[PDB]
Amino acid sequence: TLTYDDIVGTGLANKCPTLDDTARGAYPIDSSQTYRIARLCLQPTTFLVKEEPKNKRQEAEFVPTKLVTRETTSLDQIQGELKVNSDGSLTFVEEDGIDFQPVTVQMAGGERIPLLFTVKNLVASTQPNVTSITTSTDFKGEFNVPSYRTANFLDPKGRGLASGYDSAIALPQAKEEELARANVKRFSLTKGQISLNVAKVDGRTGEIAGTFESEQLSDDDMGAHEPHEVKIQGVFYASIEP
Amino acid sequence: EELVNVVDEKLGTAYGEKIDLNNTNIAAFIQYRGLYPTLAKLIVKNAPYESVEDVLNIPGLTERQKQILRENLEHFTVTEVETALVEGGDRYNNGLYK
Amino acid sequence: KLPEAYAIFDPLVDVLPVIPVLFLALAFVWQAAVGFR
Amino acid sequence: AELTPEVLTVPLNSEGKTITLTEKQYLEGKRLFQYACASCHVGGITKTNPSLDLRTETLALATPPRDNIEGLVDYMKNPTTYDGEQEIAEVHPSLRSADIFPKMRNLTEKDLVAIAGHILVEPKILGDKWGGGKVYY
Amino acid sequence: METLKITVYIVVTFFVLLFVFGFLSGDPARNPKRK
Amino acid sequence: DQESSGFAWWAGNARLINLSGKLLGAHVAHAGLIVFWAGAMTLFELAHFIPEKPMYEQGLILIPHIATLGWGVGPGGEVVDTFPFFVVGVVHLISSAVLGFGGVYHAIRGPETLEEYSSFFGYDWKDKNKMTTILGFHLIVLGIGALLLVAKAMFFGGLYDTWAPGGGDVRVITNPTLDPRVIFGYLLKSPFGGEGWIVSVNNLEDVVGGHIWIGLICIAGGIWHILTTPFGWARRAFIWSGEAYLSYSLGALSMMGFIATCFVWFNNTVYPSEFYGPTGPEASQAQAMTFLIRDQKLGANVGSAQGPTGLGKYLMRSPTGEIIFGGETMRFWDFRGPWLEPLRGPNGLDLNKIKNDIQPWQERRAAEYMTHAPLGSLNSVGGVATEINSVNFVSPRSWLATSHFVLAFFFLVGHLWHAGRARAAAAGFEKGIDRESEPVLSMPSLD
Amino acid sequence: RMPAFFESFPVILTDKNGVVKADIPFRRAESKYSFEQQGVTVSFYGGELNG
Amino acid sequence: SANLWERFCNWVTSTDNRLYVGWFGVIMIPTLLAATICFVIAFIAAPPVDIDGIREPVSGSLLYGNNIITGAVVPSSNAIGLHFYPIWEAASLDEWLYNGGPYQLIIFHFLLGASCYMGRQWELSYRLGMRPWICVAYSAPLASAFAVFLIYPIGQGSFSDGMPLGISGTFNFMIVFQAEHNILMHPFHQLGVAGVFGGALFCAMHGSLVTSSLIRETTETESANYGYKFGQEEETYNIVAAHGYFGRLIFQYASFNNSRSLHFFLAAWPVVGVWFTALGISTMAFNLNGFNFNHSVIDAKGNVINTWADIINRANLGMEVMHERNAHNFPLDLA
Ligand code: CLA
Ligand code: CLA
Ligand code: CLA
Ligand SMILES: C=Cc1c(C)c2cc3nc(c4c5[nH]c(cc6nc(cc1[nH]2)C(C)=C6CC)c(C)c5C(=O)[C@@H]4C(=O)OC)[C@@H](CCC(=O)OC/C=C(\C)CCC[C@H](C)CCC[C@H](C)CCCC(C)C)[C@@H]3C
Ligand SMILES: CC1=C(/C=C/C(C)=C/C=C/C(C)=C/C=C/C=C(C)/C=C/C=C(C)/C=C/C2=C(C)CCCC2(C)C)C(C)(C)CCC1
Ligand SMILES: CC1=C(/C=C/C(C)=C/C=C/C(C)=C/C=C/C=C(C)/C=C/C=C(C)/C=C/C2=C(C)CCCC2(C)C)C(C)(C)CCC1
Ligand SMILES: [Ca+2]
Ligand SMILES: [Fe+2]
């Protein structure tokens, strides 16, 4: 119905597919038939950042933060095969799509926490004995959190990993010892965890919807400082097909 | 307790001497007879190789493609997949041009 | 693409656009002859 | 007295023969080169695919070999990838596709010779400049 | 944030008005002696 | 005339402020230089124009206008027949002799005042009515002209249509956009990014409808004026002087001069881009198209590809969420063009389509445009300032937009110059402060 | 060496006749003379690092 | 009364108000106060602004690591482009600040007020019965502020481009512009220079000569300045002794003697010249750049002989390459 000249600017292009309160259906899983996920969407809604320990080991919590970017957060076009291995459980294997978005949120104090909201190489599974996906179903799994910046990124003073300066070019005769940290750009790579909990179904069309929560790490800045912990709470659509 | 630049370090290995099947970027193959266009995309598109010869075992290769690969194996090598060099599709567009 | 027949005018056709400039230049020859009354 | 007929001698065939193009052809080759190439191959590079250039050594490792007249000529008639695997006359100007790349329509077997002959003489004059760019401007 | 948009337009309109009228108010007239 | 009697030599033409007869010849003679040009230059173009070589690659700017009206083009702007060009060019070149004859005559032989030579043609500046009359006529004359376009579209051959369903090609509009809503909409549409202003207009239905909606307004005014006189406020508002009348018409042109510089630089519709070069944003877009394709057609997974900053080389999102092309081109995510739309979906550039619906005609069209972007030097040397010689070319889109901003600007300067002079020649002191009665000398000091 | 003029200067290493033999790259993507790749070393004489 | 509006219109138009608020001034006054006030705060405190499109925020304010010379108000983001980004279009000030909202607010307002300021520079003259045109001499600077803050961006597609409000970022705008348009090699700039360079030259001349021919009316121990009295009757120096010397310096007719004819040449030279540079920036805004003589003077064999135009280009490349290091993904800089 709605087209491009229909959505452009409304920012509806970031929010993704809903299911009118009719859901609660059940999509029959054949097991004798191969299933795949046409389009898996993940729409961020809330970002929290565990307050850096106070040093005083007294249970740090995840505080809310303000989105300093715009409506450039959603993950969409994600697809891959929804494998039906033994014991009825389903396993989704992420194949390709717009599975990552650089988000930057301004935190309570003053800071600005840029993270790489993603679900790359995601592989989520469900409860054993899954017959007809229902509101009781849900997936969980890990995924790879690449690295905010690529090997090619240069810093304000020129230094970089796969390219760029070797050192503090502007301080020719200073001690390199203490500048090491920032002159050698390391490229991290870590694991992230999610869990999509189905809230609506449409037995017919074969499309489920729901809420998701994932936890990952922030940007370490080519390893200049420690990364902050993030938790993302959003919504997700998912069109399943044989 | 030393910080190390993975890329400069990798220019000590075979990488920096021969085309690394697991790391080097696709445009590296445009330096040997009929190897680029079609094979390069294959080589690269086929995960890491536990060792040079393993190229020879890529799916649906023609007894001709296979013949060439054997010819150029002497220019290939293999090293641990290095994220900094592989991540971000850097193997199809490492950001360089003329 | 100037139809063959006319193609004996290429040289002329090539100069026509500049004429207008000339007017402004002739208007200066006029005032020079009239001593800029 | 610098662009001598020796600097104008480039491999004709792949077996070994050579052709000593005239200073008349050269110039015309250049005119034709800017007419249908430069747009994308200025300085002997490639705006829409920097990976492949027109450096003589590069054409040599091409497939089939393009480091000679016949080869370049074949190309302008029916282009293929650097491996020869695919015919690419539908996205690269050629005679096999003049209906889509008009400029090519004029071109005649004679022209094709010059344009080609030009791609082989330039690097003889310019040297490294012909290959890369910016860096060498 | 919407309230700020309203305000501003109200505010911008007030002045745009003043300007248009002020000249319509027979400005030519205001000067030493309109020959 | 003379200086010791009129003005000053370099101010000559003001010596005609009150000599309508000559002032007619001035206007006629000139209105001949424009036609002369339109004509003399179209043949200069044509005499060089090469049937099958991009127009934009040949420094043409007049022929492109004629082609857009649907004259000697055919599919994709194929330049099917040159004659319409030769035809249009000469007609003008001749009508210049006519007008030229009038000017020379009316500014020499003819009466140098229409006073008694004919009381209907004679006119009075302060005559706050014979003006409203003359205006009225002209207002009708323009109307007839506007309607001429609608004719060429709805009845005689149609016009060019880049957006042509089959693809660029002449098309007869037969569904002009009537309705104030859509038409006048463009009128109050922000001139800022995205929602353009008048420069939007992406279809000929509207271009035509909009014009139909003009005569039936422009002529409606041409009458209301030949049938009335300025109301109260109207009189106590403007300065009724010949020079002052000029001023208002000076700013008018200047204001449009920009509206034009913007039109030929941004619009794709009423400036095909098949005849003119590609839009500036259009070319910055096509470079991404070109490489999103080349790399995909080579192993890359453009949808997941992440660039140096973390935004993704080929695709990223816009502030409102749409999926656009990545790189500096993120600024031109407003570009809408024929060759690209088929890859657009409801949320923006769609992956599936991009992944396997990219016909070759686009791959090469996209390449054509990125290699013909609006960049070059004064001595016409296409490309970036650091580029080497060869490929001399400068987009018509540049030449045009460039010239008109100069003209457009200087005219605004001109506007002030006269609007400021006539507005003080009225109060009457444009020649200096009256020694004897310095207004300032009779005003309470401020300190 | 650094020409008193340049705030910063690249480190190029050449042989006897000034042939570029080694250097420190900027874009590793295609280093040909990078140290390591050339296996450069350094020895000291006199001074306190002598030997 | 007599209906306050009638009255209001009289004050607004008072010919004797310390500062002449006019009809134009009714806008100039609030517009410039919004700009000037937002600028002063932005410059002192204000988070780093993601200028280019990426996410590499630049900080320009003082409380964020700058000094007067380096600090600046950074241009709205490239992701924003030419789009209209007012405060109400932000989800929060922080968003507005991070994306460079302050810039748009500040320039749209300065350009509006600076224009009315031009209009105002006419109204008063009129109200004082003096000749107009002063406002036309001021149309040169305005035209230059318009080119640099509005025209150049409309051409390039984004306010991210277009000189940033700060001393050092102004040098940035230039050093880059060169590399992208080879401006020093464009007629309009050279005329800009002849204007600005010339202007100064004549400012020294006029000021020079006049001072050199003041009529002795003071002791040796008291300012030469006292010899003139505000509003005094006749001239205060010998415009003939002036010409008597200058004429002889070069040669009689290669000189002035008509104060009116001389003073006009003073206001026309720099204005005409400065207009042009405005027309250059406004012209190179649509990519009709400066002259290009790269690889001309080729020799007999075809060897390129390099002229100074090349050493130029060589230094231009270096600029072209390093600028906006992380903002490019493809070979050609078409934005
Ligand atoms: C729209 C059309 C227009 C019209 C009908 C008029 C009409 C008039 N003008 Mg205005 N004027 C205009 C636009 C227009 N002007 C603009 C845009 C400007 C800003 C530059 C001016 C600036 C202007 C000034 C400064 C003056 C007038 C004056 C006058 C009056 C006398 C004419 C005259 O002196 O001619 C004589 C003309 C010449 C000396 C020759 C033209 C010289 C120009 C500078 C050359 C440009 C030529 C070409 C573009 C460049 C050559 C190529 C180059 C690369 C070498 C007359 C009423 C005069 C007056 O008395 O005011 C009431 C006066 O002093 N005008
Ligand atoms: C192109 C535009 C243009 C036009 C149409 C006019 C028109 C006019 N000018 Mg202006 N003028 C212009 C530009 C223009 N001027 C410029 C740029 C300047 C600054 C140098 C002046 C300076 C100026 C002055 C100083 C004076 C005029 C005067 C006049 C008026 C009387 C003409 C005259 O005295 O001829 C004199 C006659 C001649 C010596 C003949 C000139 C040759 C003819 C006209 C050209 C024939 C054209 C073509 C080659 C043949 C076509 C023929 C074909 C159709 C068969 C006339 C309305 C006068 C005025 O105001 O009168 C009260 C006056 O004193 N003008
Ligand atoms: C060729 C163009 C043209 C011209 C020059 C005129 C000229 C004139 N008209 Mg006519 N008119 C025209 C076309 C034209 N009209 C058309 C097509 C129609 C439709 C039939 C009319 C209908 C019409 C009516 C109904 C009336 C006039 C009147 C008048 C006279 C004075 C009114 C006025 O100008 O107020 C100037 C306007 C203002 C003081 C308002 C300013 C505020 C507005 C809302 C903002 C405008 C902002 C703009 C959109 C933004 C850009 C601004 C820029 C500076 C950046 C004047 C002689 C009046 C008259 O006296 O009758 C004869 C009158 O009552 N006209
Ligand atoms: C922008 C460049 C600039 C130039 C070209 C310039 C030129 C001139 N200024 C003069 C005067 C002045 N200039 C003044 C203030 C200024 N002048 C300025 C800037 C300039 N002034 C500035 C910024 C100021 C401060 C406001 C004053 C106060 C005066 C005068 O009183 C005087 C004058 O009379 O005014 C008109 C004239 C002296 C004639 C002379 O000395 O002959 C003798 C020397 C000759 C003939 C030999 C030339 C000597 C030089 C060293 C050699 C240059 C080599 C080549 C000839 C040319 C170089 C080529 C270029 C492409 C680089 C001369 C026309
Ligand atoms: C008043 C005056 C003036 C002005 C003037 C003018 C503005 C004029 C115009 C004029 C004109 C405006 C003219 C025109 C003419 C035209 C002609 C004479 C034409 C002819 C044509 C022909 C003949 C055509 C044909 C052809 C063809 C078809 C093809 C081939 C070639 C040819 C070309 C042959 C002046 C400044 C001097 C001075 C003062 C006074
Ligand atoms: C849709 C369309 C179209 C159409 C168009 C139209 C319909 C238009 C209209 C238009 C219009 C409808 C316009 C209007 C305008 C206006 C103006 C421009 C005005 C101005 C004014 C002024 C300037 C005033 C002034 C003043 C004041 C304010 C105050 C007091 C005083 C005075 C009087 C001075 C087209 C074809 C393009 C295309 C397609 C689409
Ligand atoms: Ca010719
Ligand atoms: Fe003075």
Side-chain angles (χ1 to χ4, degrees), chain A residues 42-49 62 73 75 78 99-101 103 115-120 122 124 139-145 191-192 194-196 211-217 228-236:
Chain A
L42 290 159
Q43 164 176 179
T45 283
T46 303
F47 296 81
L48 300 68
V49 174
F62 287 78
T73 59
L75 313 199
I78 292 188
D99 67 342
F100 85 99
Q101 294 283 159
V103 174
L115 63 174
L116 192 74
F117 179 51
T118 172
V119 294
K120 285 189 183 303
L122 172 67
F139 314 58
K140 302 196 179 182
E142 284 178 323
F143 59 80
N144 290 137
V145 174
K191 285 289 179 180
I194 357 176
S195 70
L196 292 61
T211 75
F212 81 76
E213 193 183 69
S214 60
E215 198 164 322
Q216 64 181 79
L217 283 183
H228 281 221
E229 284 193 56
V230 177
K231 170 172 292 175
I232 300 84
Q233 306 186 175
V235 178
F236 86 80

Side-chain angles (χ1 to χ4, degrees), chain F residues 251-294:
Chain F
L253 299 204
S254 172
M255 178 191 90
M256 297 176 253
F258 289 119
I259 313 164
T261 288
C262 273
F263 237 99
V264 85
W265 187 250
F266 284 103
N267 196 67
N268 215 325
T269 306
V270 300
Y271 290 96
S273 188
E274 285 116 318
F275 313 138
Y276 296 100
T279 315
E282 185 162 50
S284 178
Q285 287 286 82
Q287 184 180 178
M289 183 69 233
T290 289
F291 287 97
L292 172 157
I293 297 177
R294 192 205 69 161

Side-chain angles (χ1 to χ4, degrees), chain D residues 34-35 38-39 42 47-51 88 90-91 100-103 105 134 137, chain F residues 52-54 57 290-291 294 297 360 363-364 367 370-372 386-388 390-391:
Chain D
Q34 314 183 327
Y35 171 71
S39 153
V42 303
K47 304 292 193 60
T48 68
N49 194 329
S51 287
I88 206 72
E90 191 178 44
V91 168
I100 286 143
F101 293 112
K103 293 188 183 188
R105 290 160 194 181
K134 308 178 79 65
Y137 291 160
Chain F
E52 282 304 35
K53 176 177 183 188
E57 285 182 45
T290 289
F291 287 97
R294 192 205 69 161
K297 174 188 185 180
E363 171 163 357
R364 60 171 178 267
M370 87 162 266
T371 63
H372 283 278
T386 69
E387 188 64 274
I388 193 180
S390 66
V391 58

Side-chain angles (χ1 to χ4, degrees), chain B residues 48-62 64-87:
Chain B
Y49 297 102
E50 289 165 283
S51 49
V52 190
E53 302 64 54
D54 292 54
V55 193
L56 304 173
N57 310 313
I58 287 172
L61 285 176
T62 79
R64 173 45 177 181
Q65 291 176 314
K66 293 189 280 179
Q67 197 159 59
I68 308 176
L69 272 167
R70 279 190 285 262
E71 292 185 320
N72 300 293
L73 296 187
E74 62 176 60
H75 297 322
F76 298 165
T77 305
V78 156
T79 304
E80 293 285 288
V81 151
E82 171 52 51
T83 326
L85 290 175
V86 187
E87 195 56 37

Side-chain angles (χ1 to χ4, degrees), chain E residues 21-33:
Chain E
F21 287 126
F23 273 126
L24 275 179
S25 300
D27 229 27
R30 341 242 175 178
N31 60 293
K33 282 178 181 178

